[PDB]
Amino acid sequence: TESQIPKMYEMIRDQMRTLASTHKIPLNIDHNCEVIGSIIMAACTNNRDLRPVDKYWFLMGPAGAEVMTEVEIDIQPQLQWAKGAVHDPKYKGQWYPFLALLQISNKTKDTILWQKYPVTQELEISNSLEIYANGHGIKDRLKNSRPRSVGPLVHLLHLKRLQENSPAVNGIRKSIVGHLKRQCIGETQKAMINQFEMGRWESLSTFAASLLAIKPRIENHFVLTYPLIANCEDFAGATLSDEWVFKAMEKISNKKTLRVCGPDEKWISFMNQIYIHSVFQTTGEDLGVLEWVFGGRFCQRKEFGRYCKKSQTKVIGLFTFQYEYWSKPLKSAPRSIEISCRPSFKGKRPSYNNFTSSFYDQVREECQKYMDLKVEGTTCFYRKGGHVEVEFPGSAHCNTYLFG
Amino acid sequence: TESQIPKMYEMIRDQMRTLASTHKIPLNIDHNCEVIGSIIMAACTNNRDLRPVDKYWFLMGPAGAEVMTEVEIDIQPQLQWAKGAVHDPKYKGQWYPFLALLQISNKTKDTILWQKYPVTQELEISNSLEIYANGHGIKDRLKNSRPRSVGPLVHLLHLKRLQENSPAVNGIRKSIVGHLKRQCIGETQKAMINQFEMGRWESLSTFAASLLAIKPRIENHFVLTYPLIANCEDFAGATLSDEWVFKAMEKISNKKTLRVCGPDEKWISFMNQIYIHSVFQTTGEDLGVLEWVFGGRFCQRKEFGRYCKKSQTKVIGLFTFQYEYWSKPLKSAPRSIEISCRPSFKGKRPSYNNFTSSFYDQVREECQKYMDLKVEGTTCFYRKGGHVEVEFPGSAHCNTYLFG
């Protein structure tokens, strides 16, 4: 799984710089990186969406003189390389699994900048559940290649979408139902997803309350973004289940060679937190968790007004990052629910005492059981510099999400 | 924006009196001024419509002996005068925005006397919402010059006209739709005007239904009428965002030189209120505020029969006006729109709980939002004699309208 990760990162950056440096697009602007990277992922999976030559919004200017303009770029050199990697045996079939993570993480910032809830509104549920709707708008081939990363609500939406709109549909339906079942580990949630496959959505609002109560398994992987990939010069130990990604971001952060673009200079801290939000998929993480782990307070979306248009994003400051702790990516669900004798032998023994003396209800019983659960994660958190097991004692910015 | 206002009123008035005084057309009758001004507006915007010499209805007679007749006039001295102001740099390109305001305000009297609902009927919606359809019949160049002043329905009708009428189609449509979005600040309405761009007029009645609850932003300005422009001898402090217009009108009213026309002498009060309705564009504004602001009851259209023909309209009395309050013209939208724990830590925390225990729905949801809030406005009213903020206490003639 992680064997092919080191080789993918190096050429992604190589193509990241090749497209940018061809038309004098500096890579120290996030918007230059995000837009070019958006062009980059366009060539990766949906090769026909992007034009071979097209004008995109870029920050053109030498030594901080970048101004908003549309610059035509030639993507054909990048198009040929990406298509040959689709079925290249050198990746052992991990190309589509690797590309699905990239599409979700990079489009996450766009969802962060423009707060929208497409899946939850389309699933007539609470809007606070779009965290469980991760992986929306991704390619269905990616959604089949890495379905575990794609949130159940997106699959539930695709389950709803599939019913709304062919033997190959089964491999789309049974898998999407399977990803819903694999992601949602709740005993009541698994069966109550199956009735969604039947076509009834009266418990869909129950799924709205269940998701808040029982947390489905959401597999995660630490993947960098285009501004960081173009600024990362080391990929020797590029894996997906250690502190290398955390160390890499600190190395990039210590370099301070990357700038961010926003409506105004107040967003420098907000979008510095966005990098931590996007890379580790911690957009919905508790703001104090990202505070203790990353040594800095995390702002809320409510602290800022409407995000400026992509046609007017202006450089506001240098990207900064710091971390004091970390953890392995969340493989299973963070919340898990995993005094007498029966002498089966006829011989006489002393006896000892260890004690002195509906469907929605079962969902609520499981829902209330997960209210009782207070510890999350799989094994533990790890301190910076290694995999030393560290368990959190308590914080101050608790109880608050980025969108909460 | 308001820098050139003092000079525009003087030069408009100078040729306003020049055209009337050339052929001995008295300026103390409303009908003479309005018809002369109807000739004045013709030379300013649509030069190719009015004849260089033509006969129009005026009141000919000395010292109250005026009688309806058609008087030929020579508009050519005003025709060449007006065309030179079209692209004169002295106005800084504000000639187009200024002429739109004059065209809308002075056509109000014709709409008040002749109650018509052209936009709503062509939009197949409730006829009681043509007041929302402000700025109908105005020049398209003016409509592209001050689209904010032109009501959304008129733009929506022009949007409907544009679909029921080419790169110029998109340019007009984007101006129409873009200023449709600016006028309607509603989050649901903004997306619900979007399908009107393509031509999905099924929610057009729902748009009328929405217009009942959500009240869009309409930019207004205080512009005098031709009977007042020709009778106003002071334009030194002529601006658009203070009490000067209210004070300038009162001096004209105190002069008691201008006379008004009507089918019979009962209309003296009705036509006096028309000046208030025409200048401040308060045709569909509540009588209670009008009674509170201006210290007098406002007669409705139902209290009088159909307006007699302009050929048989007779002078019915002297123009009068009085006011006690005012307000800065509506710039932003008149309507105003501006609980649980989500653990992610591994730490032991004091638990806090803040709770003890379809598209049309969203459209009705935002509709209900304006229903719930009991304030329609942001800052204040103002009293006569200055800009002292005087909050509106209430009135007995509330919920009663000129066409309501």
Coordinates of all heavy atoms in Angstrom, one line a residue, chain A residues 121 128 212 215 284-286 288-289 335 374-376 379-381 391-395 397-399 401, chain B residues 185 187 190 217 338-353 355 358-359 362 365:
Chain A
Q121 N -27.9 18.1 2.5 CA -29.1 18.7 2.0 C -29.8 17.8 1.0 O -31.1 17.7 1.1 CB -28.9 20.1 1.4 CG -28.7 21.2 2.4 CD -30.0 21.5 3.2 OE1 -30.1 21.3 4.4 NE2 -31.0 22.0 2.4
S128 N -24.9 19.6 9.7 CA -23.7 19.3 10.5 C -23.1 18.0 10.3 O -22.2 17.6 11.0 CB -24.0 19.5 12.0 OG -24.5 20.8 12.3
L212 N -24.1 11.3 14.3 CA -23.6 12.1 15.5 C -23.3 11.3 16.7 O -22.4 11.5 17.4 CB -24.6 13.2 15.8 CG -25.1 14.1 14.7 CD1 -26.4 14.8 15.0 CD2 -24.0 15.1 14.3
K215 N -20.0 6.9 15.4 CA -19.1 7.4 14.4 C -18.6 6.3 13.5 O -17.9 5.4 14.0 CB -17.9 8.1 15.1 CG -18.2 9.2 16.0 CD -17.0 10.0 16.5 CE -17.4 11.3 17.2 NZ -16.2 12.1 17.6
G284 N -12.8 18.6 10.4 CA -13.8 18.5 11.4 C -13.2 18.1 12.8 O -14.0 17.9 13.7
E285 N -11.9 18.1 12.9 CA -11.3 17.8 14.2 C -11.6 18.9 15.2 O -11.7 20.1 14.8 CB -9.8 17.6 14.0 CG -9.1 17.0 15.2 CD -9.3 15.5 15.3 OE1 -9.5 14.8 14.2 OE2 -9.4 14.9 16.4
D286 N -11.7 18.6 16.5 CA -11.9 19.5 17.5 C -10.7 20.6 17.5 O -9.6 20.2 17.4 CB -12.0 18.8 18.9 CG -12.5 19.8 20.0 OD1 -12.5 21.0 19.8 OD2 -13.0 19.2 21.0
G288 N -9.3 22.3 19.7 CA -8.2 22.1 20.7 C -7.4 20.9 20.4 O -6.2 20.9 20.8
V289 N -7.9 19.9 19.7 CA -7.1 18.8 19.3 C -6.0 19.3 18.4 O -4.8 18.9 18.5 CB -7.9 17.7 18.7 CG1 -7.0 16.5 18.2 CG2 -8.9 17.1 19.6
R335 N -14.7 5.5 17.9 CA -15.5 5.0 19.0 C -15.7 3.5 18.8 O -16.3 3.1 17.8 CB -16.8 5.8 19.2 CG -16.6 7.2 19.6 CD -18.0 7.9 19.8 NE -17.9 9.2 20.5 CZ -18.9 10.0 20.6 NH1 -20.1 9.8 20.1 NH2 -18.7 11.2 21.2
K374 N -16.4 8.0 25.8 CA -15.7 9.3 26.0 C -14.3 9.3 25.3 O -13.8 10.4 25.0 CB -15.6 9.7 27.4 CG -15.3 11.2 27.7 CD -16.5 12.0 27.2 CE -16.3 13.5 27.6 NZ -15.2 14.1 26.9
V375 N -13.7 8.1 25.1 CA -12.4 8.0 24.5 C -12.5 7.7 23.0 O -13.4 6.9 22.7 CB -11.5 7.0 25.2 CG1 -12.1 5.6 25.1 CG2 -10.1 7.0 24.7
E376 N -11.7 8.3 22.2 CA -11.7 8.1 20.8 C -10.4 7.6 20.3 O -9.4 7.4 21.1 CB -12.2 9.3 20.0 CG -13.6 9.7 20.3 CD -14.1 10.9 19.5 OE1 -13.3 11.5 18.7 OE2 -15.2 11.4 19.7
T379 N -5.4 3.5 18.9 CA -4.4 3.2 19.9 C -4.1 4.3 20.8 O -4.3 4.2 22.0 CB -3.2 2.6 19.2 OG1 -2.7 3.6 18.2 CG2 -3.5 1.3 18.4
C380 N -3.6 5.4 20.3 CA -3.1 6.6 21.1 C -2.7 7.7 20.1 O -2.6 7.5 18.9 CB -2.0 6.2 22.0 SG -0.7 5.2 21.2
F381 N -2.4 8.8 20.7 CA -1.7 9.9 20.1 C -0.2 9.7 20.3 O 0.3 9.1 21.3 CB -2.1 11.3 20.6 CG -3.2 11.9 19.8 CD1 -4.5 11.9 20.2 CD2 -2.9 12.6 18.6 CE1 -5.5 12.5 19.4 CE2 -3.8 13.2 17.8 CZ -5.2 13.1 18.2
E391 N -1.4 9.8 25.7 CA -2.8 9.9 25.9 C -3.2 11.3 26.4 O -2.5 11.8 27.3 CB -3.3 8.9 26.8 CG -3.4 7.5 26.2 CD -3.7 6.4 27.2 OE1 -4.0 6.7 28.4 OE2 -3.5 5.2 26.9
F392 N -4.2 11.9 25.8 CA -4.5 13.3 26.1 C -5.1 13.4 27.5 O -5.9 12.6 27.9 CB -5.5 13.8 25.0 CG -5.6 15.3 25.0 CD1 -4.7 16.0 24.3 CD2 -6.6 16.0 25.6 CE1 -4.7 17.4 24.3 CE2 -6.7 17.4 25.6 CZ -5.7 18.1 24.9
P393 N -4.7 14.5 28.2 CA -5.3 14.7 29.6 C -6.6 15.6 29.6 O -7.5 15.4 30.5 CB -4.2 15.3 30.4 CG -3.5 16.1 29.3 CD -3.6 15.3 28.0
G394 N -6.7 16.5 28.7 CA -7.7 17.5 28.8 C -7.2 18.9 28.3 O -6.1 19.2 28.5
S395 N -8.1 19.7 27.7 CA -7.8 20.9 27.1 C -8.8 22.0 27.5 O -9.6 21.8 28.4 CB -7.7 20.8 25.6 OG -7.4 22.0 24.9
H397 N -10.0 24.6 24.7 CA -10.8 24.9 23.5 C -11.7 23.8 23.1 O -12.0 23.7 21.9 CB -9.9 25.4 22.4 CG -9.3 26.7 22.6 ND1 -8.4 27.0 23.6 CD2 -9.5 27.9 21.9 CE1 -8.0 28.3 23.5 NE2 -8.7 28.8 22.5
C398 N -12.1 22.9 24.0 CA -12.8 21.7 23.8 C -14.2 22.0 23.2 O -14.6 23.2 23.1 CB -13.0 20.9 25.1 SG -11.4 20.3 25.8
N399 N -14.9 21.0 22.7 CA -16.3 21.0 22.4 C -16.6 21.7 21.1 O -17.8 21.8 20.8 CB -17.1 21.5 23.6 CG -16.8 20.8 24.9 OD1 -16.7 19.6 24.9 ND2 -16.7 21.6 26.0
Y401 N -16.0 22.6 17.0 CA -15.5 22.2 15.7 C -15.2 23.5 14.8 O -15.5 24.6 15.2 CB -16.5 21.3 14.9 CG -16.4 19.8 15.2 CD1 -15.5 19.4 16.3 CD2 -17.1 18.9 14.5 CE1 -15.4 18.1 16.6 CE2 -16.9 17.5 14.8 CZ -16.1 17.1 15.8 OH -16.0 15.8 16.1
Chain B
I185 N -31.2 40.0 -1.9 CA -30.1 39.5 -1.0 C -30.4 38.2 -0.4 O -29.5 37.6 0.2 CB -29.8 40.5 0.2 CG1 -31.0 40.4 1.2 CG2 -29.6 41.9 -0.3 CD1 -30.6 40.9 2.6
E187 N -30.7 34.4 0.4 CA -29.8 33.2 0.1 C -30.6 32.3 -0.8 O -30.1 31.7 -1.8 CB -29.3 32.5 1.3 CG -28.0 33.1 1.9 CD -26.9 33.2 0.8 OE1 -26.4 32.2 0.5 OE2 -26.6 34.4 0.4
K190 N -31.5 34.1 -4.3 CA -30.4 34.3 -5.2 C -30.2 33.0 -6.1 O -30.1 33.1 -7.3 CB -29.1 34.5 -4.5 CG -28.8 36.0 -4.1 CD -27.7 36.1 -3.1 CE -27.6 37.5 -2.6 NZ -27.2 38.5 -3.7
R217 N -33.6 44.3 -2.0 CA -32.9 45.6 -1.9 C -33.2 46.5 -3.1 O -33.1 46.0 -4.3 CB -31.4 45.4 -1.8 CG -30.6 46.7 -2.2 CD -29.1 46.5 -1.7 NE -28.6 45.2 -2.0 CZ -27.4 44.7 -1.6 NH1 -26.6 45.5 -0.9 NH2 -27.1 43.5 -1.9
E338 N -28.8 40.2 9.2 CA -27.4 40.3 9.8 C -27.4 41.2 11.0 O -28.4 41.8 11.3 CB -26.5 40.9 8.7 CG -25.0 40.9 9.2 CD -24.1 41.4 8.1 OE1 -24.5 42.4 7.3 OE2 -23.0 40.9 7.9
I339 N -25.2 23.7 19.6 CA -25.8 23.6 20.8 C -25.6 22.3 21.5 O -26.4 21.8 22.3 CB -27.4 23.9 20.7 CG1 -27.9 23.0 19.5 CG2 -27.6 25.4 20.4 CD1 -29.4 23.1 19.5
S340 N -24.5 21.6 21.1 CA -24.2 20.3 21.7 C -22.7 20.1 21.5 O -22.0 20.8 20.8 CB -24.9 19.2 20.9 OG -24.6 17.9 21.4
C341 N -22.2 19.1 22.2 CA -20.8 18.8 22.3 C -20.4 17.8 21.2 O -21.2 16.8 20.9 CB -20.4 18.2 23.6 SG -18.7 17.6 23.7
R342 N -19.3 18.0 20.5 CA -18.7 17.1 19.5 C -17.3 16.7 19.9 O -16.3 17.4 19.5 CB -18.8 17.8 18.1 CG -20.1 17.7 17.4 CD -21.1 18.8 17.9 NE -22.3 18.8 17.1 CZ -23.4 18.2 17.5 NH1 -23.4 17.4 18.6 NH2 -24.5 18.3 16.7
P343 N -17.2 15.7 20.8 CA -15.8 15.4 21.3 C -14.9 14.8 20.2 O -15.4 14.1 19.3 CB -16.1 14.3 22.3 CG -17.6 14.3 22.5 CD -18.2 15.0 21.4
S344 N -13.6 15.2 20.3 CA -12.6 14.5 19.5 C -11.3 14.3 20.3 O -10.4 13.6 19.8 CB -12.2 15.4 18.3 OG -13.4 15.8 17.5
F345 N -11.2 14.8 21.5 CA -10.1 14.5 22.3 C -10.0 13.1 22.9 O -11.0 12.4 22.8 CB -10.1 15.5 23.5 CG -9.8 16.9 23.2 CD1 -10.8 17.8 23.1 CD2 -8.5 17.4 23.0 CE1 -10.6 19.1 22.8 CE2 -8.2 18.7 22.7 CZ -9.3 19.6 22.6
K346 N -8.8 12.7 23.4 CA -8.7 11.6 24.2 C -8.6 11.9 25.7 O -8.4 11.1 26.5 CB -7.4 10.8 23.8 CG -7.5 9.3 24.0 CD -6.3 8.6 23.7 CE -6.5 7.1 23.7 NZ -5.2 6.3 23.6
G347 N -8.8 13.2 26.0 CA -8.7 13.7 27.4 C -10.1 13.7 28.1 O -11.1 13.6 27.5
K348 N -10.0 13.7 29.5 CA -11.1 13.8 30.3 C -11.5 15.2 30.5 O -10.7 16.1 30.8 CB -10.8 13.2 31.7 CG -10.8 11.6 31.7 CD -10.7 11.1 33.1 CE -10.7 9.6 33.1 NZ -10.5 9.0 34.5
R349 N -12.8 15.5 30.2 CA -13.3 16.9 30.0 C -14.6 17.0 30.7 O -15.3 16.1 30.9 CB -13.5 17.1 28.5 CG -12.2 17.2 27.7 CD -12.5 17.1 26.2 NE -12.9 15.7 25.8 CZ -13.3 15.3 24.6 NH1 -13.5 16.2 23.7 NH2 -13.6 14.1 24.4
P350 N -14.9 18.3 31.2 CA -16.2 18.5 31.7 C -17.2 18.6 30.6 O -17.2 19.5 29.8 CB -16.0 19.9 32.5 CG -14.6 20.3 32.3 CD -14.0 19.4 31.3
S351 N -18.2 17.6 30.6 CA -19.1 17.6 29.5 C -20.1 18.7 29.6 O -20.6 19.1 30.7 CB -19.9 16.3 29.6 OG -19.0 15.2 29.5
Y352 N -20.4 19.4 28.5 CA -21.3 20.5 28.4 C -22.4 20.2 27.4 O -22.0 19.8 26.2 CB -20.6 21.8 28.1 CG -19.7 22.3 29.2 CD1 -18.3 22.3 29.0 CD2 -20.2 22.8 30.4 CE1 -17.5 22.7 30.0 CE2 -19.3 23.2 31.4 CZ -18.0 23.2 31.2 OH -17.1 23.6 32.1
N353 N -23.6 20.4 27.7 CA -24.8 20.2 26.8 C -25.6 21.5 26.8 O -26.1 21.8 27.9 CB -25.6 19.0 27.1 CG -24.8 17.7 27.0 OD1 -24.0 17.5 26.1 ND2 -25.1 16.7 27.9
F355 N -28.5 21.8 25.2 CA -29.8 21.4 24.9 C -30.3 20.5 26.1 O -29.6 19.6 26.5 CB -30.0 20.7 23.6 CG -29.5 19.3 23.5 CD1 -30.4 18.2 23.6 CD2 -28.1 19.1 23.4 CE1 -29.9 16.9 23.5 CE2 -27.7 17.8 23.4 CZ -28.5 16.7 23.4
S358 N -37.2 19.8 1.0 CA -37.7 20.3 -0.3 C -37.2 21.8 -0.5 O -37.0 22.5 0.5 CB -39.2 20.2 -0.5 OG -39.8 21.4 0.1
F359 N -37.0 22.2 -1.7 CA -36.5 23.5 -2.0 C -37.5 24.6 -1.6 O -37.2 25.6 -1.1 CB -36.1 23.7 -3.5 CG -35.6 25.0 -3.8 CD1 -34.4 25.5 -3.3 CD2 -36.3 25.9 -4.7 CE1 -33.9 26.7 -3.6 CE2 -35.8 27.1 -5.0 CZ -34.6 27.6 -4.5
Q362 N -37.3 25.3 2.0 CA -36.2 26.3 2.2 C -36.6 27.7 1.8 O -36.2 28.6 2.4 CB -34.9 25.8 1.5 CG -34.6 24.3 1.6 CD -34.4 23.9 3.0 OE1 -33.3 24.1 3.6 NE2 -35.4 23.3 3.7
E365 N -38.7 28.7 4.3 CA -37.9 28.9 5.5 C -37.3 30.3 5.5 O -37.4 31.0 6.6 CB -36.8 27.8 5.6 CG -35.7 28.1 6.6 CD -35.0 26.9 7.0 OE1 -35.2 25.8 6.4 OE2 -34.1 26.9 8.0

